[model samples]
Target: MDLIIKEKRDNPILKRKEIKYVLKFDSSRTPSREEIKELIAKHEGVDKELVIVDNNKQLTGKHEIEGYTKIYADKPSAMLYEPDYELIRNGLKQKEAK
Candidate 1:
Protein backbone atom coordinates (compact mmCIF):
# COMPACT_ATOMS: atom_id res chain seq x y z
CA MET A 1 0.00 0.00 0.00
CA ASP A 2 1.13 3.49 -0.82
CA LEU A 3 -0.36 6.82 0.17
CA ILE A 4 -0.22 9.83 -2.09
CA ILE A 5 -1.17 12.94 -0.22
CA LYS A 6 -3.27 15.14 -2.48
CA GLU A 7 -4.06 17.84 0.01
CA LYS A 8 -3.44 18.60 3.66
CA ARG A 9 -5.20 21.43 5.40
CA ASP A 10 -4.85 22.34 9.05
CA ASN A 11 -7.99 23.72 10.57
CA PRO A 12 -7.38 25.79 13.65
CA ILE A 13 -10.99 25.83 14.78
CA LEU A 14 -11.26 22.08 14.52
CA LYS A 15 -7.69 21.57 15.77
CA ARG A 16 -6.95 18.94 13.21
CA LYS A 17 -5.38 18.12 9.90
CA GLU A 18 -7.92 17.42 7.18
CA ILE A 19 -6.26 15.24 4.59
CA LYS A 20 -7.15 13.99 1.12
CA TYR A 21 -5.12 11.27 -0.50
CA VAL A 22 -4.90 8.60 -3.12
CA LEU A 23 -4.05 5.08 -2.09
CA LYS A 24 -2.37 2.64 -4.40
CA PHE A 25 -2.83 -1.00 -3.71
CA ASP A 26 -1.23 -4.17 -4.95
CA SER A 27 -4.57 -5.97 -5.07
CA SER A 28 -8.02 -5.12 -6.36
CA ARG A 29 -9.83 -5.84 -3.13
CA THR A 30 -11.47 -2.91 -1.41
CA PRO A 31 -9.78 -2.16 1.90
CA SER A 32 -11.73 -1.93 5.12
CA ARG A 33 -11.96 1.22 7.22
CA GLU A 34 -9.73 -0.34 9.84
CA GLU A 35 -6.99 -0.94 7.30
CA ILE A 36 -7.31 2.56 5.94
CA LYS A 37 -7.13 3.94 9.43
CA GLU A 38 -3.85 2.15 10.10
CA LEU A 39 -2.44 3.09 6.72
CA ILE A 40 -3.28 6.75 7.10
CA ALA A 41 -1.92 6.90 10.61
CA LYS A 42 1.35 5.17 9.70
CA HIS A 43 1.93 7.18 6.53
CA GLU A 44 1.04 10.48 8.16
CA GLY A 45 3.00 9.68 11.35
CA VAL A 46 -0.03 10.28 13.56
CA ASP A 47 -1.55 8.06 16.19
CA LYS A 48 -3.96 5.44 14.86
CA GLU A 49 -6.41 6.63 17.50
CA LEU A 50 -6.42 10.07 15.97
CA VAL A 51 -7.24 8.94 12.42
CA ILE A 52 -10.55 8.44 10.68
CA VAL A 53 -11.02 7.22 7.13
CA ASP A 54 -13.81 8.55 4.89
CA ASN A 55 -15.25 7.68 1.47
CA ASN A 56 -13.00 4.65 1.29
CA LYS A 57 -13.40 3.00 -2.11
CA GLN A 58 -11.58 1.49 -5.05
CA LEU A 59 -11.49 2.78 -8.60
CA THR A 60 -11.73 0.10 -11.23
CA GLY A 61 -8.61 -0.19 -13.41
CA LYS A 62 -6.95 2.73 -11.64
CA HIS A 63 -5.26 0.62 -8.97
CA GLU A 64 -5.99 3.46 -6.62
CA ILE A 65 -8.56 4.81 -4.20
CA GLU A 66 -9.20 8.45 -3.50
CA GLY A 67 -10.46 9.40 -0.07
CA TYR A 68 -10.20 11.74 2.85
CA THR A 69 -9.14 11.53 6.52
CA LYS A 70 -8.90 13.60 9.63
CA ILE A 71 -6.05 13.69 12.15
CA TYR A 72 -7.24 15.44 15.24
CA ALA A 73 -4.67 17.42 17.18
CA ASP A 74 -5.98 15.85 20.34
CA LYS A 75 -8.38 13.21 21.54
CA PRO A 76 -10.78 15.90 22.77
CA SER A 77 -11.04 17.49 19.34
CA ALA A 78 -11.48 14.09 17.82
CA MET A 79 -14.36 13.35 20.11
CA LEU A 80 -15.97 16.67 19.30
CA TYR A 81 -15.93 16.24 15.52
CA GLU A 82 -15.81 12.54 14.81
CA PRO A 83 -18.88 10.40 14.20
CA ASP A 84 -20.00 7.89 16.78
CA TYR A 85 -19.19 4.95 14.56
CA GLU A 86 -15.63 6.10 13.98
CA LEU A 87 -15.02 6.82 17.62
CA ILE A 88 -16.45 3.44 18.48
CA ARG A 89 -14.18 1.74 16.01
CA ASN A 90 -11.20 3.35 17.73
CA GLY A 91 -12.50 2.53 21.17
CA LEU A 92 -12.62 6.18 22.17
CA LYS A 93 -16.28 6.48 23.06
CA GLN A 94 -17.36 7.32 26.56
CA LYS A 95 -20.87 6.39 25.44
CA GLU A 96 -19.82 2.81 24.83
CA ALA A 97 -18.87 2.10 28.43
CA LYS A 98 -22.29 0.76 29.25
Candidate 2:
Protein backbone atom coordinates (compact mmCIF):
# COMPACT_ATOMS: atom_id res chain seq x y z
CA MET A 1 0.00 0.00 0.00
CA ASP A 2 1.18 3.52 -0.80
CA LEU A 3 -0.10 6.58 1.04
CA ILE A 4 0.05 10.08 -0.32
CA ILE A 5 -0.93 12.93 1.91
CA LYS A 6 -3.25 15.23 0.04
CA GLU A 7 -3.63 17.90 2.71
CA LYS A 8 -2.52 18.52 6.25
CA ARG A 9 -3.75 21.08 8.75
CA ASP A 10 -2.48 21.86 12.19
CA ASN A 11 -4.97 22.83 14.86
CA PRO A 12 -3.22 24.32 17.81
CA ILE A 13 -6.41 24.57 19.81
CA LEU A 14 -7.05 20.89 19.32
CA LYS A 15 -3.40 20.00 19.63
CA ARG A 16 -3.55 17.67 16.67
CA LYS A 17 -2.86 17.38 12.98
CA GLU A 18 -5.65 16.66 10.56
CA ILE A 19 -4.74 14.95 7.32
CA LYS A 20 -6.42 13.92 4.13
CA TYR A 21 -4.68 11.21 2.13
CA VAL A 22 -4.89 9.13 -0.98
CA LEU A 23 -3.87 5.50 -0.79
CA LYS A 24 -2.90 3.12 -3.54
CA PHE A 25 -2.76 -0.60 -3.14
CA ASP A 26 -1.97 -3.47 -5.44
CA SER A 27 -4.60 -5.81 -4.00
CA SER A 28 -8.27 -5.65 -4.86
CA ARG A 29 -9.33 -5.91 -1.25
CA THR A 30 -9.90 -2.74 0.74
CA PRO A 31 -7.47 -2.11 3.51
CA SER A 32 -8.66 -2.42 7.08
CA ARG A 33 -8.73 0.53 9.47
CA GLU A 34 -6.00 -1.02 11.59
CA GLU A 35 -3.75 -1.47 8.57
CA ILE A 36 -4.23 2.13 7.47
CA LYS A 37 -3.70 3.45 10.97
CA GLU A 38 -0.45 1.53 11.29
CA LEU A 39 0.76 2.87 7.98
CA ILE A 40 -0.08 6.49 8.84
CA ALA A 41 1.49 6.25 12.27
CA LYS A 42 4.64 4.75 10.81
CA HIS A 43 4.87 7.46 8.21
CA GLU A 44 4.23 10.29 10.66
CA GLY A 45 6.54 8.86 13.32
CA VAL A 46 3.75 8.80 15.84
CA ASP A 47 2.28 6.01 17.90
CA LYS A 48 -0.63 4.11 16.40
CA GLU A 49 -2.63 4.96 19.49
CA LEU A 50 -2.44 8.66 18.66
CA VAL A 51 -3.58 8.18 15.08
CA ILE A 52 -7.30 8.08 14.38
CA VAL A 53 -8.49 7.09 10.92
CA ASP A 54 -11.78 8.96 10.51
CA ASN A 55 -12.79 7.18 7.32
CA ASN A 56 -11.67 5.71 3.99
CA LYS A 57 -13.61 5.29 0.79
CA GLN A 58 -12.57 3.33 -2.28
CA LEU A 59 -12.66 5.10 -5.58
CA THR A 60 -14.76 3.67 -8.38
CA GLY A 61 -12.88 1.50 -10.88
CA LYS A 62 -9.65 2.08 -9.08
CA HIS A 63 -7.37 0.33 -6.61
CA GLU A 64 -7.15 3.43 -4.50
CA ILE A 65 -8.85 5.08 -1.52
CA GLU A 66 -9.16 8.49 0.07
CA GLY A 67 -9.35 9.07 3.80
CA TYR A 68 -9.07 11.43 6.71
CA THR A 69 -7.06 11.00 9.87
CA LYS A 70 -6.11 12.96 12.96
CA ILE A 71 -2.78 12.73 14.72
CA TYR A 72 -3.02 13.79 18.32
CA ALA A 73 -0.21 15.26 20.34
CA ASP A 74 -0.75 12.76 23.12
CA LYS A 75 -2.84 9.75 24.01
CA PRO A 76 -4.76 11.59 26.68
CA SER A 77 -5.64 14.44 24.32
CA ALA A 78 -6.82 11.89 21.79
CA MET A 79 -9.03 10.19 24.34
CA LEU A 80 -10.44 13.53 25.34
CA TYR A 81 -10.97 14.89 21.84
CA GLU A 82 -12.19 11.84 19.97
CA PRO A 83 -15.55 10.20 20.34
CA ASP A 84 -15.93 6.77 21.87
CA TYR A 85 -16.88 5.18 18.55
CA GLU A 86 -13.83 6.62 16.83
CA LEU A 87 -11.58 5.41 19.62
CA ILE A 88 -13.20 2.01 19.42
CA ARG A 89 -12.81 1.90 15.67
CA ASN A 90 -9.10 2.72 16.01
CA GLY A 91 -8.71 -0.01 18.66
CA LEU A 92 -7.73 2.58 21.23
CA LYS A 93 -10.83 1.89 23.30
CA GLN A 94 -12.59 -1.37 24.00
CA LYS A 95 -16.17 -1.92 22.92
CA GLU A 96 -18.81 -1.56 25.56
CA ALA A 97 -20.35 -4.75 26.90
CA LYS A 98 -23.99 -5.20 26.09
Candidate 3:
Protein backbone atom coordinates (compact mmCIF):
# COMPACT_ATOMS: atom_id res chain seq x y z
CA MET A 1 0.00 0.00 0.00
CA ASP A 2 1.09 3.57 -0.71
CA LEU A 3 -0.14 6.62 1.19
CA ILE A 4 -0.53 10.11 -0.11
CA ILE A 5 -1.15 12.83 2.42
CA LYS A 6 -3.58 15.28 0.91
CA GLU A 7 -4.07 17.68 3.80
CA LYS A 8 -2.77 18.20 7.34
CA ARG A 9 -3.74 20.83 9.84
CA ASP A 10 -3.18 21.40 13.51
CA ASN A 11 -6.20 21.82 15.76
CA PRO A 12 -4.71 23.53 18.75
CA ILE A 13 -8.03 23.88 20.52
CA LEU A 14 -8.55 20.15 20.31
CA LYS A 15 -4.89 19.29 20.76
CA ARG A 16 -4.85 17.22 17.61
CA LYS A 17 -3.83 17.06 13.98
CA GLU A 18 -6.47 16.58 11.31
CA ILE A 19 -5.35 14.72 8.24
CA LYS A 20 -6.89 13.80 4.91
CA TYR A 21 -5.26 11.15 2.79
CA VAL A 22 -5.49 8.84 -0.17
CA LEU A 23 -4.24 5.29 -0.11
CA LYS A 24 -3.31 3.10 -3.03
CA PHE A 25 -3.31 -0.64 -2.48
CA ASP A 26 -2.40 -3.58 -4.68
CA SER A 27 -4.77 -5.98 -3.00
CA SER A 28 -8.00 -7.37 -4.48
CA ARG A 29 -10.14 -6.01 -1.63
CA THR A 30 -10.29 -2.80 0.31
CA PRO A 31 -8.21 -2.78 3.45
CA SER A 32 -9.79 -2.97 6.86
CA ARG A 33 -10.07 0.09 9.12
CA GLU A 34 -7.56 -1.32 11.57
CA GLU A 35 -5.06 -1.89 8.78
CA ILE A 36 -5.43 1.67 7.57
CA LYS A 37 -5.14 3.07 11.09
CA GLU A 38 -1.95 1.13 11.72
CA LEU A 39 -0.48 2.32 8.45
CA ILE A 40 -1.29 5.96 9.29
CA ALA A 41 0.30 5.66 12.70
CA LYS A 42 3.43 4.14 11.21
CA HIS A 43 3.67 6.80 8.52
CA GLU A 44 3.15 9.66 11.00
CA GLY A 45 5.66 8.26 13.49
CA VAL A 46 3.05 8.44 16.24
CA ASP A 47 1.79 5.76 18.55
CA LYS A 48 -1.05 3.67 17.13
CA GLU A 49 -3.10 4.64 20.16
CA LEU A 50 -2.97 8.29 19.15
CA VAL A 51 -4.30 7.72 15.67
CA ILE A 52 -8.04 7.62 15.00
CA VAL A 53 -9.23 6.89 11.50
CA ASP A 54 -12.54 8.71 11.19
CA ASN A 55 -13.53 7.71 7.69
CA ASN A 56 -12.52 5.29 4.95
CA LYS A 57 -14.12 5.02 1.53
CA GLN A 58 -12.98 3.07 -1.46
CA LEU A 59 -13.05 4.71 -4.83
CA THR A 60 -15.35 3.09 -7.36
CA GLY A 61 -13.56 0.67 -9.67
CA LYS A 62 -10.21 1.41 -8.12
CA HIS A 63 -7.87 -0.04 -5.56
CA GLU A 64 -7.72 3.27 -3.75
CA ILE A 65 -9.24 4.65 -0.59
CA GLU A 66 -9.78 8.13 0.78
CA GLY A 67 -9.75 8.72 4.49
CA TYR A 68 -9.69 11.25 7.27
CA THR A 69 -8.02 10.90 10.63
CA LYS A 70 -7.16 12.65 13.82
CA ILE A 71 -3.80 12.39 15.54
CA TYR A 72 -4.21 13.57 19.07
CA ALA A 73 -1.49 15.03 21.22
CA ASP A 74 -2.55 12.72 24.00
CA LYS A 75 -5.00 9.91 24.55
CA PRO A 76 -7.05 12.00 26.93
CA SER A 77 -7.52 14.72 24.35
CA ALA A 78 -8.59 12.14 21.87
CA MET A 79 -11.13 10.73 24.24
CA LEU A 80 -12.49 14.19 24.87
CA TYR A 81 -12.74 15.16 21.22
CA GLU A 82 -13.94 11.98 19.58
CA PRO A 83 -17.40 10.51 19.89
CA ASP A 84 -18.09 7.30 21.78
CA TYR A 85 -19.01 5.29 18.69
CA GLU A 86 -15.77 6.23 16.98
CA LEU A 87 -13.75 5.32 20.05
CA ILE A 88 -15.55 2.01 20.22
CA ARG A 89 -14.91 1.34 16.55
CA ASN A 90 -11.23 2.13 17.02
CA GLY A 91 -11.09 -0.29 19.93
CA LEU A 92 -10.07 2.34 22.41
CA LYS A 93 -13.24 2.09 24.45
CA GLN A 94 -15.48 -0.74 25.51
CA LYS A 95 -19.17 -0.70 24.71
CA GLU A 96 -21.42 0.42 27.47
CA ALA A 97 -24.14 -1.80 28.91
CA LYS A 98 -27.48 -1.10 27.31
Candidate 4:
Protein backbone atom coordinates (compact mmCIF):
# COMPACT_ATOMS: atom_id res chain seq x y z
CA MET A 1 0.00 0.00 0.00
CA ASP A 2 1.37 3.37 -1.02
CA LEU A 3 0.18 6.85 -0.09
CA ILE A 4 0.21 9.54 -2.75
CA ILE A 5 -1.15 13.07 -2.75
CA LYS A 6 -2.84 13.94 -6.02
CA GLU A 7 -3.77 17.61 -5.47
CA LYS A 8 -3.82 20.45 -2.98
CA ARG A 9 -6.51 23.04 -2.35
CA ASP A 10 -5.92 25.87 0.15
CA ASN A 11 -8.60 27.85 1.84
CA PRO A 12 -8.08 31.10 3.66
CA ILE A 13 -8.12 30.92 7.45
CA LEU A 14 -9.96 34.10 8.26
CA LYS A 15 -11.91 33.25 11.37
CA ARG A 16 -13.61 30.43 13.27
CA LYS A 17 -16.74 30.99 11.21
CA GLU A 18 -14.92 29.93 8.02
CA ILE A 19 -14.12 26.39 9.23
CA LYS A 20 -17.55 25.24 8.10
CA TYR A 21 -17.26 27.03 4.76
CA VAL A 22 -13.56 26.51 3.97
CA LEU A 23 -12.80 23.28 5.78
CA LYS A 24 -9.26 21.92 5.77
CA PHE A 25 -8.64 18.27 4.98
CA ASP A 26 -6.01 15.94 3.55
CA SER A 27 -6.64 12.84 1.44
CA SER A 28 -3.67 10.71 2.36
CA ARG A 29 -2.68 7.12 1.72
CA THR A 30 -3.05 4.32 4.22
CA PRO A 31 -0.41 4.13 6.92
CA SER A 32 1.02 1.04 8.60
CA ARG A 33 -0.56 -0.53 11.70
CA GLU A 34 2.65 -0.09 13.67
CA GLU A 35 2.67 3.56 12.68
CA ILE A 36 -0.95 3.89 13.79
CA LYS A 37 -0.40 2.35 17.21
CA GLU A 38 2.78 4.33 17.77
CA LEU A 39 0.99 7.59 17.01
CA ILE A 40 -1.87 6.77 19.38
CA ALA A 41 0.54 5.98 22.17
CA LYS A 42 2.69 9.03 21.46
CA HIS A 43 -0.11 11.50 22.00
CA GLU A 44 -1.14 11.83 25.63
CA GLY A 45 -3.93 14.40 25.49
CA VAL A 46 -6.46 12.60 23.33
CA ASP A 47 -8.39 9.58 24.62
CA LYS A 48 -7.96 6.25 22.86
CA GLU A 49 -10.78 4.87 20.76
CA LEU A 50 -11.78 1.44 19.46
CA VAL A 51 -11.41 0.34 15.84
CA ILE A 52 -13.76 -1.44 13.44
CA VAL A 53 -12.25 -3.34 10.55
CA ASP A 54 -13.82 -4.19 7.21
CA ASN A 55 -11.88 -6.52 4.95
CA ASN A 56 -13.63 -5.57 1.71
CA LYS A 57 -11.74 -2.31 1.26
CA GLN A 58 -8.06 -1.80 0.50
CA LEU A 59 -5.28 0.14 2.28
CA THR A 60 -6.37 -0.55 5.83
CA GLY A 61 -9.57 -1.84 4.17
CA LYS A 62 -12.18 0.37 5.76
CA HIS A 63 -10.61 -0.44 9.10
CA GLU A 64 -10.73 2.25 11.74
CA ILE A 65 -7.36 3.85 12.45
CA GLU A 66 -8.37 4.96 15.89
CA GLY A 67 -6.88 6.72 18.97
CA TYR A 68 -5.43 9.75 17.26
CA THR A 69 -7.00 13.18 17.46
CA LYS A 70 -5.96 16.33 15.64
CA ILE A 71 -6.26 20.07 15.98
CA TYR A 72 -4.74 22.76 13.81
CA ALA A 73 -3.97 26.44 13.63
CA ASP A 74 -4.24 28.69 10.54
CA LYS A 75 -0.71 29.63 9.67
CA PRO A 76 1.11 30.16 6.37
CA SER A 77 0.69 26.85 4.53
CA ALA A 78 -2.78 25.66 5.46
CA MET A 79 -3.76 24.19 2.12
CA LEU A 80 -5.39 20.78 1.73
CA TYR A 81 -4.47 17.89 -0.55
CA GLU A 82 -7.47 16.68 -2.51
CA PRO A 83 -8.08 14.02 -5.19
CA ASP A 84 -6.27 16.06 -7.87
CA TYR A 85 -9.13 15.87 -10.34
CA GLU A 86 -7.33 18.20 -12.73
CA LEU A 87 -4.12 16.22 -12.50
CA ILE A 88 -6.06 13.07 -13.34
CA ARG A 89 -8.01 14.92 -16.02
CA ASN A 90 -4.99 16.59 -17.63
CA GLY A 91 -2.82 13.52 -17.26
CA LEU A 92 0.15 15.83 -16.66
CA LYS A 93 1.09 19.41 -17.36
CA GLN A 94 4.14 20.98 -18.96
CA LYS A 95 5.57 24.30 -17.87
CA GLU A 96 6.57 25.34 -21.38
CA ALA A 97 3.54 25.75 -23.65
CA LYS A 98 5.65 25.26 -26.75
On TM-score, the candidate that comes out on top is 2
97, model 3: CA deviation in Å? 32
- List, residue by residue over 1-98, the lDDT tens digit for candidate 2: 77776546575555677777766777867777766777775454456766776677666667777777678656766566765544545332346532
TM-score: the better of candidates 1 and 3? 3
Question: How are the candidates ranked when ordered by lDDT, highest leading?
Answer: 2, 3, 1, 4
- Please list the C-alpha lDDT of all candidates, in the order they appear: 0.64, 0.66, 0.65, 0.27
Per-model TM-score on C-alpha atoms = 0.52, 0.54, 0.53, 0.18
C-alpha displacement of 82 in model 2, angstroms?
17
Per-prediction count of colliding residue pairs? 0, 0, 0, 0
RMSD of each: 9.8, 10.7, 10.5, 17.1
The residue-by-residue lDDT of candidate 4 on 1-98, one tens digit each, is: 22221212233333111110111123576555644422332232221221112221123435332222232222212333344324345443476533
Sorted on TM-score, best first, the list reads: 2, 3, 1, 4
Once superposed on the true structure, which residue ranges of model 3 sit more than 4 Å away at CA?
11-13, 29-35, 57-61, 76-98
* Tens-digit lDDT string for candidate 1 (1-98): 67776546575645577676677677857766666666776565466666766676555567777777777657655566765545545444565643
Give the Å shift of residue 40 in candidate 1. 1.1
Give me the overall lDDT of model 2. 0.66
